[PDB]
Amino acid sequence: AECSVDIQGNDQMQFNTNAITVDKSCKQFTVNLSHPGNLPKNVMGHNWVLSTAADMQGVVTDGMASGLDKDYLKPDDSRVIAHTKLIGSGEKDSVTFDVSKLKEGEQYMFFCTFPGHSALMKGTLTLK
Ligand SMILES: [Zn+2]
């Protein structure tokens, strides 16, 4: 929609989009995450995490190492540009970040860091 996107994470470990475009005129960009379904956070948790395509693996490995209680994200990880909390079904969370944190010609990825989900739950984010 205008400088924002609503995205869903379901019980089959799927996001309903796999490509996000952010227009350079946006001062800010907002992602609104929801989780349709019935499974709880500890079985099917999903968060929306954004980093460069280069940093994603490091973010995923260290996130797995943080624990459920840490939302499977390394606290104050410098490589995460923006992220929601980890949510279960029926829950909701949003994040607004400044678009100046992204630069032209850099590849970005969004993904879920919940153990085992990033292999299937990821997509690209692009500044146009
Ligand atoms: Zn997930």
UniProtKB/Swiss-Prot annotation:
This is Azurin. PROSITE patterns: COPPER_BLUE. InterPro entries: Azurin, BlueCu_1, BlueCu_1_BS, Cu-binding_ET, Cupredoxin. Disulfide bonds join C3-C26. Cu cation binds at H46, C112, H117, M121. It is found in: Periplasm. Residues 1-128 form the Plastocyanin-like domain. Keywords: Copper, Disulfide bond, Electron transport, Metal-binding, Periplasm, Signal, Transport. It comes from the Bacteria. The gene is azu. Its main location: periplasm. GO terms for cellular component: periplasmic space; plasma membrane. The keyword ATP-binding does not apply.
